[PDB]
Structure 1
Amino acid sequence: AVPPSLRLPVIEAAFPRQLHPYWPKLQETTRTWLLEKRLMPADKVEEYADGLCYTDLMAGYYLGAPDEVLQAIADYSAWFMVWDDRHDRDIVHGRAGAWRRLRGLLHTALDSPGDHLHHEDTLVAGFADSVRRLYAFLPATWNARFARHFHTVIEAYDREFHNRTRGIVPGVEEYLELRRLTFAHWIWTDLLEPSSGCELPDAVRKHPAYRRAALLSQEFAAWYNDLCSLPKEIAGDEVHNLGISLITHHSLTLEEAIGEVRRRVEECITEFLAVERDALRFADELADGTVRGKELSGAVRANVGNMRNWFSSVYWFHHESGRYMVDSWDDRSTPPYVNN
């Protein structure tokens, strides 16, 4: 059961959870990867990794993915969690130089991951290993789009570094634009395609129904994260959160901001339900009787189905993962799974 302040009855009633059959092997393989790439200390891997539920999150999202595709996605996603932790710790400890150098190496490794597989910085080497594997599934045109999207994500993280160092809370609209990048909306959307085995042509993925369904899936996920991660983020002096922007710039109380974020999250669901009908009609239209048409139709249908799965996976992840359980920590500002 979910606390009433975080409960979304429409998710529970209309978005039933799904789990990829590879999940049991995925859980252990990603844990071993985190250990072997030295992305987390061995004792913290053993104590916390399974409880963090990072593989559960992805195995509830990219249904139908080939096992090796899901493995690369899960490793990359766990890396992404550790990177968020490193970014936070660099801010907290004022390591502007270390952040800047890491930022530059990630930009370079993103374009040439093979060159960085054995880099002295284990965080860079881990990134490169996952990215090189992601680059082996689809044509180089997809790889170039992934890279373009992630260069933008890195710079959004750099903007967050500047905001927190300068004591700046973004305005609400500024935040919503930034959040599409710090949450990596377009990366998760890109990764639908290797999961269904097909790079979608620009004309297909830029169709308004596909774009809008993809957007709303990610807006829900990011703002639901904001709702559930607000306590940990307040305790950690994090400033990036829709609720924090509302409190700071619209002078809402903590209770008023929670209610406002909740209402915006709820609206994402029913806006998605409306556009999902249009997106599945588009999927039907692509089935024009040709082989390629059947392939594109099936791929769009699978991707839209996983856009829907993201709602339930993200919902339950926030209640299962130890990442957000600030009430259990000795130091509310320092999560125990983080390298401080």
Structure 2
Amino acid sequence: AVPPSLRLPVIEAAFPRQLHPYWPKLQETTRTWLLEKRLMPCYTDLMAGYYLGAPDEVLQAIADYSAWFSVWDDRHDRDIVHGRAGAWRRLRGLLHTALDSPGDHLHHEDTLVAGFADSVRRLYAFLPATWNARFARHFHTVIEAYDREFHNRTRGIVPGVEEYLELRRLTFAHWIWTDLLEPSSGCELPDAVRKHPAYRRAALLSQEFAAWYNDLCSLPKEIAGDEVHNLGISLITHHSLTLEEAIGEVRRRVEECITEFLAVERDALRFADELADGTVRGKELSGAVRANVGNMRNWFSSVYWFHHES
């Protein structure tokens, strides 16, 4: 049930889908939140196949943040095609402020900002302040990355290949989704653990696959819409690739993500085994790493099948 150019047999054979038991209540509860926040007149299935093991309240807050994220991206796109640079700048500034102090913005006149503030307020309630500050530091970067995308897209500038890859780690919010692994498994990871090279590399590859596979699926539509910002378009524009050639290159980069992930997933799980040193704290850290890496794995199949279902 998958067009041959988009089919990844290793995902189909070796990454069995998982579904969180709270999924049936997720979409309606998110709809109710969007309605209460006046953010509409779904990515919830995507999240339910990703953050396995999350407490119901954690998954619900992630789903609401994820849905808020979809509304912000629609607004961003509309400001882009209407060239509303003043409106975008003001939103960009309000989101930076609301991120650091959400409580002051819970009833802001801009419903997108008030909804962001409540979403982030709820995410800040699961782990210690040090995790909250990490999330904020990471999302400040996402906001500025969205600003560089506004710059490129309003001016019709196609970024270079590495320039796009570096930017897309930020607009896709790679490190936000990675941060959210930790409230899902109930444990803030020490820097020495989450900065372990196997943990970092596993987390990166999971996110690269998701962002690059999205670009692969959307490439034909986006070149026909004269878009910029897609890995295939940077390759066409800057490496003189034809469309078929760019589809083949993105596809190979996507396939290699998988097998590179399988190798580093072994290293991350060995590390998880090393953390279980016979102490209670070590067992806790080991289970958290193993749960987090398992969800890094779940991202692959959740994203793959989401594209073909939605």
TM bucket, shorter chain: over 0.9
Structure-1 residue corresponding to 2:179: 190
Count how many residue pairs are aligned between Structure 1 and Structure 2.
Answer: 310
CA offset digits 1:116-143 (Å, max 9, x no partner): 1111101111111110000000000000
* 2:222 pairs with one of 228, 233, 253: 233
Q: Aligned equivalents of 2:131 and 2:205: distance in 1?
A: 22
CA offset digits 1:145-195 (Å, max 9, x no partner): 000000000000000000111221000011110010011000000000000
Unaligned runs of 5+ in 1: 42-52, 321-339
Q: Aligned equivalents of 1:129 and 1:236: distance in 2?
A: 35
Q: Aligned equivalents of 2:224 and 2:40: distance in 1?
A: 22
The alpha-carbon deviation at position 231 of structure 1 amounts to: 3.5
Computed over aligned residues only, the root mean square deviation of the Cα atoms, in angstroms, reads 1.5
Q: Aligned equivalents of 1:143 and 1:231: distance in 2?
A: 39
The alpha-carbon deviation at position 237 of structure 1 amounts to: 4.1
The alpha-carbon deviation at position 236 of structure 1 amounts to: 4.3
CA offset digits 1:289-321 (Å, max 9, x no partner): 11100100000000000000000001011111x
Normalised TM-score (structure 1): 0.90
CA offset digits 1:86-129 (Å, max 9, x no partner): 11110000110000000000000100111111111011111111
CA offset digits 1:308-339 (Å, max 9, x no partner): 0000001011111xxxxxxxxxxxxxxxxxxx
The alpha-carbon deviation at position 233 of structure 1 amounts to: 2.9
The alpha-carbon deviation at position 235 of structure 1 amounts to: 4.5
Q: Aligned equivalents of 2:187 and 2:225: distance in 1?
A: 41
* 1:141 pairs with one of 105, 113, 130: 130
CA offset digits 1:221-241 (Å, max 9, x no partner): 000011112234335443111
Q: Aligned equivalents of 2:113 and 2:126: distance in 1?
A: 21
The alpha-carbon deviation at position 39 of structure 1 amounts to: 1.1
1:258 and 2:247 are equivalent in the alignment: yes
More off after superposition, 212-221 vs 26-35: 26-35
Q: Aligned equivalents of 2:194 and 2:224: distance in 1?
A: 39
* 2:88 pairs with one of 99, 102, 127: 99
CA offset digits 1:268-295 (Å, max 9, x no partner): 0000000000000000000011110010
Unaligned runs of 5+ in 2: none
Q: Aligned equivalents of 1:236 and 1:77: distance in 2?
A: 26
Normalised TM-score (structure 2): 0.98
